[PDB]
Amino acid sequence: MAEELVLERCDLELETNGRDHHTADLCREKLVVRRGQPFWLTLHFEGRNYQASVDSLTFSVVTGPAPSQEAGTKARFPLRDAVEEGDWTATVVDQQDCTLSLQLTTPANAPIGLYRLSLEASTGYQGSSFVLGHFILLFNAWCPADAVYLDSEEERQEYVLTQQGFIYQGSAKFIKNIPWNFGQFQDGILDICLILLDVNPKFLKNAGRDCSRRSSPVYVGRVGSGMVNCNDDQGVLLGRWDNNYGDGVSPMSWIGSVDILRRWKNHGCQRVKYGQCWVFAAVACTVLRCLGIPTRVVTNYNSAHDSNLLIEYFRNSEMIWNFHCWVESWMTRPDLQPGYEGWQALDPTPQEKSEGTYCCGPVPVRAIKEGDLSTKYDAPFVFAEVNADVVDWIQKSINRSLIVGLKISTKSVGRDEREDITHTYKYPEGSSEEREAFTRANHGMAMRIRVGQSMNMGSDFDVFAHITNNTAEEYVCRLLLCARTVSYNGILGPECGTKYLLNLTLEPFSEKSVPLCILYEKYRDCLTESNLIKVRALLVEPVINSYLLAERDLYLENPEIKIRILGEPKQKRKLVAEVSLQNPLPVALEGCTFTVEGAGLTEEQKTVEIPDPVEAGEEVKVRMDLVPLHMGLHKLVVNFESDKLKAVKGFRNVI
């Protein structure tokens, strides 16, 4: 007898829902709500209203292209009074002549995204099923049961709802606060953000699983950040640091994330040119804030102090920059060991390189501080941005030419002020906690410059970076080994040999002597009458960001003047002195002249002239007459001068 209900219309209650879900800017036309929290829909029936004793109403929701109940992307649930906490439910909260106001709740771990809501109404022996509408479901920092819950309203306002903020740039000494329009609730931005998820490589690999995993703010943070500068062509931005941004738009121009996002969408999800670290970070903040994950942009500063090999290596994309920016997002970490909930570092700057679909993060900030580098995801990459260990061997010594991890900064909550969060990444220098973390992060290595034989002006010779690994672990390092001439007063001249090794493998409990050949032809023209060559080595281990420097000055010695004493040493009479020198160069010597003197042996300075040039390796001798007189020691003294080999000295004691 009872006939089926006829829905006239469903009122999405955008106004009360927007307000209560903190989604009002997003609900001007469509319904956007947050998980784990009741929202309202008001049904209007044509004719007869719902009667619980006759009518059975059942709701169905699906999200994604392959919804399933086991995946959590499909749910079916009846309209009824009993409300099971933590489930998809619908209950009556008001009933008037023609209207039925319902309260629907979603699980606090439901997948986020666009859902289609359908209703089946059944009266007795008949049923009818149809589409009520759609809603977008987001993460809920207000819901205690949600992984992204933040216990503080002022922080929820800052990190989810506030659409403008500050990105710090400049330097550690001169911090710049650049205002930024994140614009997460601007028209079209949420749709663009859902698009970004639906073109991510994990969605292409398995869209049903991808949409299911969108329950997790770990998963969505990883994908969201990871997609901003994505090795695949569908990422949001392309990086560039060569001051040459004419293809497109300069990183320094942008004052917001919105225009970039809209550009990206409009050009077939093709990367927008160009980003730099803070532009990637800024767009990541927009995306993640849109989806409901509390997020904040952070800047770390690094500082040099200036001939250093270390600063050369870098000067002339895991560099160490004047500043670097990433984001932090707030969430629990049930996928990790207990106690890692809270801020998680996400770094959307280009190179996904070691392993995995994305880099870098999320990694708990506490894991970084604690040097617990086995914690997923990509902990070494974030550790390396705020730590660098640099040691000199001039011969063991700490080198502060490079200080990384200074004045780590983010906008203060509810204020236009800078909050220093360095303490969150780094224990104080020299503290037991710092040293204990440094121990956990690297679980014996040494370097010095060796030669192994005499070094002679005119010769080609090898120098060696002698690297010792006295630990149980393998190391893969980059090595820079080079030589430059140097003056007695410490002025570095031109290069006379260089060797770069991208891939030096150091086996456990082993050593290597890595040679570099120093050629006469390379140091000859550019070398001081000091005869000095500075050899410098830099061993880099980019994973932990550790640096070993070795430096040694070498003296290229002059040829010896042989001085021979013909005749007797008796305290009296005639005596002849034979002095010689072998040309050590591979080239002939022009304008050779010996000058000789020595009171007690001679009374005239004897200067010999050698017109016949001394060929390479040829020795030249000259004999000259002495005449002693008294008991004891006399020192004959010799100068040899040339066009290519000046002021070489010698002496001999006689009697």
Partner: peptide, 5 residues
């Protein structure tokens, strides 16, 4: 812009 430290 971003420059080496």
């Amino acid at each position: 812009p971003x420059l080496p430290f």
